[PDB]
Amino acid sequence: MSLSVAEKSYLYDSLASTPSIRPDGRLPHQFRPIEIFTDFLPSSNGSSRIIASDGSECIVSIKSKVVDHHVENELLQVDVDIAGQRDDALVVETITSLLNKVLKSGSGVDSSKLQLTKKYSFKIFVDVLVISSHSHPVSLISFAIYSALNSTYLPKLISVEELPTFHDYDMVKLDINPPLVFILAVVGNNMLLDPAANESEVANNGLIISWSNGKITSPIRSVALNDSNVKSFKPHLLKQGLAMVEKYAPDVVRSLENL
Amino acid sequence: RLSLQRANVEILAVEDATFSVSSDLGETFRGIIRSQDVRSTDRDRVKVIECFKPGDIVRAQVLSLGDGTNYYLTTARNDLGVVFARAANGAGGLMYATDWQMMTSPVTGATEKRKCAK
Amino acid sequence: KDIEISASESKFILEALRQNYRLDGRSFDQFRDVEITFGKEFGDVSVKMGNTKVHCRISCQIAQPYEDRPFEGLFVISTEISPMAGSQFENGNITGEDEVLCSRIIEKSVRRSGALDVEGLCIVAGSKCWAVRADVHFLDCDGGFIDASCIAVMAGLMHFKKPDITVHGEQIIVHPVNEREPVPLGILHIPICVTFSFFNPSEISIIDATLKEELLRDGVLTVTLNKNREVVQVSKAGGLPMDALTLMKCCHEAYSIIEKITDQILQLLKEDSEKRNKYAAMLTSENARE
Amino acid sequence: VITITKRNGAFQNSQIVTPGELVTDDPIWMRGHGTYFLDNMTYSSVAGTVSRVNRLLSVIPLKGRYAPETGDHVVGRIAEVGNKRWKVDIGGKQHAVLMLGSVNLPGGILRRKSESDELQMRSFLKEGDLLNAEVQSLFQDGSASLHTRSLKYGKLRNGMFCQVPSSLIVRAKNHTHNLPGNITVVLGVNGYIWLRKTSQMDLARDTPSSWQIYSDENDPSISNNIRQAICR
Amino acid sequence: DVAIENNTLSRYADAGNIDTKNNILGSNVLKSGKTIVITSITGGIIEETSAAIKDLDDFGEEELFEVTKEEDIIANYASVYPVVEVERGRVGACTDEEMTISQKLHDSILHSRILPKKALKVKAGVRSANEDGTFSVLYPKMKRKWSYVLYAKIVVLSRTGPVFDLCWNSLMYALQSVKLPRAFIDETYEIICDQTKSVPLMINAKNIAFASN
Amino acid sequence: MSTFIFPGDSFPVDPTTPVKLGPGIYCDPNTQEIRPVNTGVLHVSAGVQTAYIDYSSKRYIPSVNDFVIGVIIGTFSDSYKVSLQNFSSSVSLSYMAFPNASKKNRPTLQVGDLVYARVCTAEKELEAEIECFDSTTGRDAGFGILEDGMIIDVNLNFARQLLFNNDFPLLKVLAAHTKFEVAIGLNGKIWVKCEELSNTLACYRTIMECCQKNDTAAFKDIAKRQFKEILT
Amino acid sequence: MSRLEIYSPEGLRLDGRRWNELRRFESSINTHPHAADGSSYMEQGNNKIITLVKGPKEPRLKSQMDTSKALLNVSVNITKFSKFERSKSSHKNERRVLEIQTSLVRMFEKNVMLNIYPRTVIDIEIHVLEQDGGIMGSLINGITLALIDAGISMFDYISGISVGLYDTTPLLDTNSLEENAMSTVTLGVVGKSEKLSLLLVEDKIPLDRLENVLAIGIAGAHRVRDLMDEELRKHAQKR
Amino acid sequence: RLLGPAAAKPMAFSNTTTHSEQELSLHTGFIENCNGSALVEARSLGHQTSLITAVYGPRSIRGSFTSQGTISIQLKNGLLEKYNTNELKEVSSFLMGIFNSVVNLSRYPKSGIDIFVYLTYDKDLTNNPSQISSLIPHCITSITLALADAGIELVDMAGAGEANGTVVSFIKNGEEIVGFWKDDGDDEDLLECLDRCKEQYNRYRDLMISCLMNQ
Amino acid sequence: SVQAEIGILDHVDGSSEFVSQDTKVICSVTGPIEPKARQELPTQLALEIIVRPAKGVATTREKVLEDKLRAVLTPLITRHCYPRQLCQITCQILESGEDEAEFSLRELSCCINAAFLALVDAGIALNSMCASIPIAIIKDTSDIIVDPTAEQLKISLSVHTLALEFVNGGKVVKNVLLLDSNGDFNEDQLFSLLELGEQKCQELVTNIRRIIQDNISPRLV
RNA sequence: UAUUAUUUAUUUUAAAA
């Protein structure tokens, strides 16, 4: 739902206080309960479904294609499709352009782990289907592509240059370090991790931070969360948010790589 | 646009006699001249077809913001009304104001009733 | 921007149906008299059935086949409707329900059901093939849009002729239409559509409803048969729920119509072929001995 | 820390009647909701339990939105400012209508002529505002007609909004209650709840006009312990 | 009054420092009054097949072709495929103005006989792999044939009236400043254009025209 | 004096004699010359000398003192919304434009009802207005709802010839076969009604066929063959 | 796979079933409670469909409001990964979707009592996660089960079943491989009756063979209604 | 006609056939269609950039009842170095999140402002083989120029700079950050990125006022 | 000699069919009718011009064909006596009668003649009459020919479309509505064909006046 | 100010006297 200007000023004064009074009252580093299903699409090499606390849901499918990397530039393509939105929408093309940067072959994802012959390699097709969304889902999708890439199985290669052949039954597991994306909301001088729906509506600005190989990696953004209260932030808040994810990201990876 | 009880107009200028006026610019305002605000003598029960025509230039003082979408204008003054019109909805000659509710073109000689301003 | 039907007009037409009366004077199982007219160029056909008038235009060009079927030719069809057939149609409304359903039914009847010999349209496998296109122009709308359009396309495909091709090793040369006479397409069977309109005051079904009857309709059914007693395609979605007995009666009644219409197209094509081949008796090369 | 429930392998983890089946063949009945009449017999249109009250035969479906009735202390949000009325989001099948002659106007009546009726309403009751009112009457389609003709109903502020299913609202004499910790709850029968700090009116009226209620200005100083109480 | 700047955006702007990752074969920046016209010309290459009856090696079919063939004067000339983009502060698809100007430029270039088809032929080469001279290209009947395809994009800024005359005059300047990159094949073998060597487009100055309303 | 004329032709009337402008001729607001704009037969009547052109047309243009058959397409607070012809602009029918009207009583007319009215206002820059009783003469007989029956589409020249010219044998040849009641609208509409539907159906088919066959002498054979066919 | 036997003399098909045996039918209700008013996860064979019903609600714009009934909008989203080969979006592939969506709207607008819900709209959002033949029939089953979950009043069930005809032997619930080798008929049977609300024949079938195919089609569709009905009984008694 | 023959292929150039200071030039006010114009050009090392920005506003939105204004920024390809349409709209949403914190939105009720940036020429002269990061600072300076020329209220000037794919936009003489963009780059580096961009921001902050006070 | 029919279509106000050589164009006119919000003109009549090709979809080629056909019919219609109204003029090209990829004058000329006849059948207020002919000059023998065949177009140096405006019995050429010329020509050839065209259009309206009179006269009384 | 209103009408309670 929307929010009235009366309760908007109520949340701003309570969140910006030195004791951050969250709506649900969690800590600025606590996340909401998440349900993640994996391995349910037989036709796909990997699949996952994630259900957020506010009813948000996202489905990821992973297909593969044998391609010559000498002629195929990007070996990892992300195709996002938000329900109720057009394919040429701005809210879709931005996340599509952003997810292809966190999962860029040779950057956030090393192209060596999906190579085959000297001539050929595997191309990963990550298709995203956002069934329901209440806030910016770039962080919820990153969790879904994480659990899907860590459960993906690609056909095993059987090996003068000739076209490659694969075994009939046996398949190898795709071992790739999948980057993670976090959303941070600044409300005055307080930094919040995983902002809710109503929380992201009164925030002064937002932060997007990637995380791969146990460290902060490119890209990172500072996109707004609502056109109403867009406020410039002190550089110490950027450092505080960039340092807060370093303190709690391993707690996420440990709680996310268990599958 | 002429309705039975209102006359939709398009604001082209405004006072700053000096004024201010701006094509593909996309910047234009519009108002509504209600029948109750056409004249001061006998406000109710008038005929806007005999006071305005589509394409006529009207000098009118604003009353207030109508419904956000349109403004509310009035012409219940001697200096407010049609200030530049043409015969047969622009298909004739340049008419000029004469009486308080009569407008005529010199060359063609045709007369048409308006709500003039003089 | 739509058609207004008065309450008295709706009641009169329905009550007339309850008394076995159609305003035009046809029976409930009577198809409108179809009239095929051929233009100058091949593949130019104008169909008139009642006040409904439709004009078709066949064309072809070299195209890339589908990688799933490198040995078949393509078939394209567009059934856009202009305000010419009635101001209720908006120009540029290509995704309308009438436009989509008309294209899909003729596409299934021609391409999918093997009416057009797509394998004969293969030039070079996986590279060169004929893409036979069918353009349909709705001239005057008095109902029976897809019924008239299916007769126009099927008459145009049998009247259309493609440029000739000679196979010379690995080379292939397309003769200009001015040198060699073009070659006709391969038409296996001739599917003809028949649309049924249903009403309820014990239901009444009429064949090939006019525009006025089409607006007071409670349910529509489209069947497509050929003279080979084959059910090419059937489309029924919603409206009055019907059972298998009512459908089979519609199919048997439609077969009596599509069989006569088939013989007419074959006869009207033969008459048009002789009109434009007056001196064809002198130019015969393969002749009998003695 | 995060609690991530993980699953692998699959996609996920009285009389009952279904739509289309026969509930009774007795013509002497009064068909209610979830029930349709056909050929002197009675069939079900939804999936639920059969209800019998006197002669009213109906089927209560499982899942269902809020059905507004006459005299309901509801909490709704303003959707749009329409011609001589408001569209308030109650949570039913349709938006409920709040007529102009059914609220406590600021200056008593409209100050005209100057602006239209609709533009003058947005000055104190814009889109998205949250308030509470009572369903005065119902339309033929089931739409609710609200009214704010008392000091008890007004524009909500100084609190936070939460939503629960409408079926989980136990009926009681009082709609709003005072809670320990200087907090007041507004249990709307439509499922909309408004948790706010106890005000001067609800504390002094439940225990034993002007545009001051249409003001969006929150309370200046709220205790930090009171706001954290609303979260719990 | 008009002011133009040719080859300003072109790949061959500097004869000494020819750009590597440039694509424009020739450009022109025109400004008449307050309207601004920017016109660049990229290009591609297409392989043409020999569908002629001469390859049948039959005298009868060839004689029948020569008798029945009718003269087609404009068939020996090609045209450019322009893309007009008049910036008027709007969003959406192509305006009726942009589409009409593109069609007029195509129809006038074709009828005025600016680009004959023989003037867009590709003198095909074969680059060799001699010993440690890495590569070497040679230029001259060959089997495979090619033809140049010219694409033009026009961006009109600060439009104050009819701009078709300005788009045409800006295109006639850019056409008189394009160079066709020489092409060659290696020794699955697609064609490659030269990195620096190029030949200017032989446009007959007899047929070039200018616009005025 | 009747002659065929074309647009742009010279008007065969001297500018000395004052001539009244009718439908077909146009007075240029600039050059003040009288010139034709339509294609048809020119008519000039030798006190007042009027001139007009009789052109073939099917799109009805509202003109005052015209009897039309309209279809109600919209009910409102104080007026109906009537359509005189498809795709055309709708006309206005006020609730006070009825015999024995009252502001406290809404007329019993719904959408889809056929009304026989009179055009009382036809301003080019405004919406046309109709009424179901003559505001000038007080007439009311014949105006109002056309219950049941069937409406027919004809060109404007066929409808005008049927209402005005008493020599048009269509009405006479129809009475020779069946008794009926007819209402002719100048907007190309003809409403007929008989006791039995079979008679009304034959009247519909005859008026349809007689409209396209301009041979007036063939109306007798049309009704003879049409009424004889429905007997089968 | 490869060259297979469609209907062996031993009465066994290529996937092991028999002529009158359906694929496995696992339906689910209320799978998306916090994202729609009606939810149904349809899993018929390898077909995986998510059907979401959002309504009846106020229309976002008054341009789509009916003062006498509700508006029914069916949106079918066929994912890029529904098949083996990840299909790329084609301009021709959009026409087939519109025909399916229109056929579904016209089908359920006659069975759903839209008069009870005036001035409202009912959005049906469908996501096909995997398809393996008989996709049209499975789409019908998902809509019927999702509308019931949303409490939308209907006259009866609408069961979707697909029947194929191989030589002279009809086969129930055709999969993808069988549709590629025979003619296919999809049916929309209303409840336990023998009345059809949908009949799509997209391939050639002899007229003398169509009578029997419909009989076996409406029969097997009654079995589909039982499987859907039983799922609603178990979900209502356990809650 | 348009598009041309589908069988034609674009030209291919082979790499084996034959072989501190960042210049700036600013202009404003030259498009009659819009209210405020701008033209920024920069040529450093083997990469030349030249783009044009036009501002059409404020435009009164019919029937709108918003309290503050709405900014619409749209990037559009030009004639050289064409980027994908997805990444262009990504920079557009990043730019809109910047100017919504700079442009006085409360001073424009029931109206919107439409920005049009045309990347007319993005030359690159590298010897032998995200590239969009080198244009974000130049686009921010171009919009602020055209927004100031259009008489639109802007709370302080806005500029940015690049530091190996790291783009940071400052305000109040670098006191507060209004935008953050970083593609590729390395790790640990952050203090030197904010420093190299801040000195580049002050270089652009005063050069924009130079051409704005002359002419 | 040319063929033309009137009132062929039922569900429109006015229709026509014009034939020349092999070019066939069917045109329909409906108006005055209710215009769209983006179409209405406050003082005069709005036109909706639509021409559709015989093959394929409507491309940008027919867009400039609409713009030229619009420039001819707009001064030919008394737009001011239909304020806030719409007129839908739709031309359907049945056969092109020429090489569509090379020439489009034989279709433009027929659309003008078909639209004018359809406007007469509809009853729209026309300020005058109109005639249109295609003109070409042959390469070898620079001879001006009126209404050239399809083969003569492929052997021509320049092609021309002349649309004139006739008043007073079809004898006084009031103005030159449209003269569209493409190819190679100089000032002497222009006035040579312009003078030749003025007398070929003059006998066209004389034949058009006879065509429409043979149809409208049996309708009226 | 719903026995109020919307004009090419988004009113969805116009019934009683």
mmCIF file of C-alpha atoms in Angstrom, chain A residues 31-123:
data_model
loop_
_atom_site.group_PDB
_atom_site.id
_atom_site.type_symbol
_atom_site.label_atom_id
_atom_site.label_comp_id
_atom_site.label_asym_id
_atom_site.label_seq_id
_atom_site.Cartn_x
_atom_site.Cartn_y
_atom_site.Cartn_z
ATOM 1 C CA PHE A 31 17.576 -9.717 7.903
ATOM 2 C CA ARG A 32 14.051 -11.041 7.427
ATOM 3 C CA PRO A 33 13.221 -14.764 7.246
ATOM 4 C CA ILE A 34 13.759 -16.253 3.789
ATOM 5 C CA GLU A 35 12.581 -19.496 2.178
ATOM 6 C CA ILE A 36 14.645 -20.890 -0.705
ATOM 7 C CA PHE A 37 13.718 -23.882 -2.868
ATOM 8 C CA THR A 38 16.174 -25.464 -5.299
ATOM 9 C CA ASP A 39 16.269 -28.159 -7.997
ATOM 10 C CA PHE A 40 12.703 -28.293 -9.276
ATOM 11 C CA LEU A 41 13.065 -27.587 -13.030
ATOM 12 C CA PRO A 42 14.289 -30.794 -14.729
ATOM 13 C CA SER A 43 14.566 -29.163 -18.168
ATOM 14 C CA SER A 44 17.044 -26.619 -16.752
ATOM 15 C CA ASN A 45 20.624 -27.119 -15.605
ATOM 16 C CA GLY A 46 19.804 -25.261 -12.387
ATOM 17 C CA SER A 47 16.813 -23.645 -10.738
ATOM 18 C CA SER A 48 15.768 -21.927 -7.524
ATOM 19 C CA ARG A 49 12.768 -20.202 -5.951
ATOM 20 C CA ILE A 50 13.010 -17.622 -3.162
ATOM 21 C CA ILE A 51 10.144 -16.230 -1.067
ATOM 22 C CA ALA A 52 10.740 -13.047 0.917
ATOM 23 C CA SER A 53 8.893 -12.020 4.073
ATOM 24 C CA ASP A 54 6.652 -9.436 2.356
ATOM 25 C CA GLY A 55 5.349 -11.999 -0.149
ATOM 26 C CA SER A 56 8.028 -11.164 -2.722
ATOM 27 C CA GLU A 57 8.877 -14.152 -4.909
ATOM 28 C CA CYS A 58 11.498 -14.768 -7.587
ATOM 29 C CA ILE A 59 12.188 -17.764 -9.838
ATOM 30 C CA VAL A 60 15.543 -18.373 -11.542
ATOM 31 C CA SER A 61 16.328 -20.848 -14.323
ATOM 32 C CA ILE A 62 19.797 -21.693 -15.643
ATOM 33 C CA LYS A 63 20.302 -23.090 -19.152
ATOM 34 C CA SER A 64 23.542 -23.886 -20.965
ATOM 35 C CA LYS A 65 24.821 -23.643 -24.532
ATOM 36 C CA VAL A 66 28.061 -24.816 -26.140
ATOM 37 C CA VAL A 67 29.642 -21.757 -27.754
ATOM 38 C CA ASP A 68 33.042 -20.738 -29.123
ATOM 39 C CA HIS A 69 34.460 -18.130 -26.743
ATOM 40 C CA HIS A 70 36.753 -16.811 -29.490
ATOM 41 C CA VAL A 71 33.580 -15.419 -31.094
ATOM 42 C CA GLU A 72 31.190 -15.208 -28.099
ATOM 43 C CA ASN A 73 32.047 -12.254 -25.859
ATOM 44 C CA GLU A 74 29.945 -12.577 -22.703
ATOM 45 C CA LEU A 75 29.635 -16.156 -21.448
ATOM 46 C CA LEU A 76 26.974 -15.246 -18.854
ATOM 47 C CA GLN A 77 23.732 -13.512 -19.853
ATOM 48 C CA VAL A 78 20.987 -12.409 -17.451
ATOM 49 C CA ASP A 79 17.407 -12.045 -18.714
ATOM 50 C CA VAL A 80 15.035 -10.481 -16.172
ATOM 51 C CA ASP A 81 11.240 -10.439 -16.547
ATOM 52 C CA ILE A 82 9.257 -8.622 -13.855
ATOM 53 C CA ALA A 83 5.582 -9.566 -13.766
ATOM 54 C CA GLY A 84 3.219 -6.720 -14.593
ATOM 55 C CA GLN A 85 5.932 -4.723 -16.388
ATOM 56 C CA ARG A 86 6.984 -4.480 -20.014
ATOM 57 C CA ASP A 87 10.297 -5.891 -21.208
ATOM 58 C CA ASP A 88 11.486 -2.418 -22.291
ATOM 59 C CA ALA A 89 10.579 -0.795 -18.966
ATOM 60 C CA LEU A 90 13.179 1.296 -17.168
ATOM 61 C CA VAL A 91 12.837 -0.644 -13.906
ATOM 62 C CA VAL A 92 13.633 -3.826 -15.862
ATOM 63 C CA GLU A 93 16.452 -2.642 -18.138
ATOM 64 C CA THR A 94 18.323 -1.146 -15.170
ATOM 65 C CA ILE A 95 18.348 -4.392 -13.181
ATOM 66 C CA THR A 96 19.096 -6.340 -16.366
ATOM 67 C CA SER A 97 22.103 -4.111 -17.059
ATOM 68 C CA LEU A 98 23.182 -4.300 -13.408
ATOM 69 C CA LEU A 99 22.909 -8.080 -12.987
ATOM 70 C CA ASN A 100 24.995 -8.627 -16.128
ATOM 71 C CA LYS A 101 27.751 -6.577 -14.462
ATOM 72 C CA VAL A 102 27.783 -8.489 -11.169
ATOM 73 C CA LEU A 103 27.829 -11.741 -13.185
ATOM 74 C CA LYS A 104 30.104 -10.544 -15.994
ATOM 75 C CA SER A 105 32.281 -13.312 -17.426
ATOM 76 C CA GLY A 106 35.867 -12.594 -16.405
ATOM 77 C CA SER A 107 34.895 -10.120 -13.666
ATOM 78 C CA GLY A 108 32.489 -11.254 -10.958
ATOM 79 C CA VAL A 109 32.399 -14.711 -12.571
ATOM 80 C CA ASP A 110 35.638 -16.273 -13.811
ATOM 81 C CA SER A 111 35.227 -17.675 -17.330
ATOM 82 C CA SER A 112 37.758 -20.437 -16.600
ATOM 83 C CA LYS A 113 35.369 -22.549 -14.507
ATOM 84 C CA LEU A 114 32.926 -23.003 -17.422
ATOM 85 C CA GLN A 115 35.419 -23.649 -20.234
ATOM 86 C CA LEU A 116 35.626 -26.849 -22.261
ATOM 87 C CA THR A 117 38.103 -27.259 -25.151
ATOM 88 C CA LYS A 118 40.694 -24.653 -26.119
ATOM 89 C CA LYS A 119 38.134 -23.506 -28.708
ATOM 90 C CA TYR A 120 34.819 -24.012 -26.899
ATOM 91 C CA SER A 121 33.223 -23.124 -23.574
ATOM 92 C CA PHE A 122 29.819 -23.102 -21.885
ATOM 93 C CA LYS A 123 27.486 -20.103 -22.000
#
